[PDB]
Design a protein around this nucleic acid. Sequence first.
RNA 1: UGAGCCUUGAUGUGUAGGAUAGGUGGGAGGCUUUGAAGUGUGGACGCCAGUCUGCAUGGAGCCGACCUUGAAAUACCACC
Lengths: 234, 128
Amino acid sequence: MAKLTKRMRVIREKVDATKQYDINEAIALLKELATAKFVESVDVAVNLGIDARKSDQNVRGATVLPHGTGRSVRVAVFTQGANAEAAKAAGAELVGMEDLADQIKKGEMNFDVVIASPDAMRVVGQLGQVLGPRGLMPNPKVGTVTPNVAEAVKNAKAGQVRYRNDKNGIIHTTIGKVDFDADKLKENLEALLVALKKAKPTQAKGVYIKKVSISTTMGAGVAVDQAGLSASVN
Amino acid sequence: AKAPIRARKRVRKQVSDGVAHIHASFNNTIVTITDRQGNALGWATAGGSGFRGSRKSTPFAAQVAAERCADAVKEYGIKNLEVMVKGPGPGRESTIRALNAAGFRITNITDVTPIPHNGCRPPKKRRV
RNA sequence: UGAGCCUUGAUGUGUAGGAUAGGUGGGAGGCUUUGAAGUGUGGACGCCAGUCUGCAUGGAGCCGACCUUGAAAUACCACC
């Protein structure tokens, strides 16, 4: 959206300058530009020069960050037959069929992630294409569709973050909280980077990364010169 | 029944005011609307109303030719008219009446009918 | 003078819906002249004068994880 208002203006005044920045001085700048009473979350926009056509010329799936976000990652379990205590012991909030099949039909899902079974997907989620930003319907390409539900639930709650294309090459991915130190953030950044390179198609060997910019929630963003290869600020 | 159509907004030249020209001959009437600076915004005829024979050169077939052109030029956004008359043919007044029924003041009925200084010889017609 | 590429910035005006349905991650809210809204001024902009929006003034609002309607659902920051 990025609507131009008063409460945004203040943030645009308090910044010193806009330019493409070194990744470490962007993170240390970006941390000043949070404004909220809520602790903001930090993510990166990586623009890929790839076609982004279905899957084959796309980068789609997930990785486990070595360090988790300071949020829980609000997990549900959409399935046709599981033990509630066993999935809940893995960390799930709700296990069922009916309540999740209602939400994804209704067009509002109370959870940020649903781990889905192939059997759950089949009735609701397999046809859905235009799924919006709360990201309710399933995908296989993301890898949230697995019969091994309790492993992906425990890994979601501990630090698993996703990467996907939109209709474009653009990858949004979660890097941490503004609570965190600079190094610990670089360590999460660099884990995503090996994952976008591991998933990269055989044809995508020209110019790949077109542009980088890193963002905080209610606060601003700072555009990035590049991602770099280091898990340490130093 | 009604459909959900977008709003109409179009422009052509928005002239607001004009001159009209009436060419009356012996077999037909030709009736023509223009801008006052001189550009055609449409025309109609009495022959294209299909009366044919003698009936084609009458005040009434001439009137309905005037109401046909005068309807079409609302799209050009003309709102007032003045008229130029050029001929001895029928539709002397009836042509005028049809522009005045188009909702115009027609205060200036300027006969400009060219009287050549005795021009070119007209056709003999029948051989007796 | 078309189109592409690209920096930012924005509309989808419908039918149900307060009203504002480009693909979608972060994500449970923001309090410089309440984020507003509003005649007025410039720009985007309609399935139609109404949504977003610079701004003297205006402190009357958006809207979700959760007002509610829905087949895509909306804050707010990004991508455009």
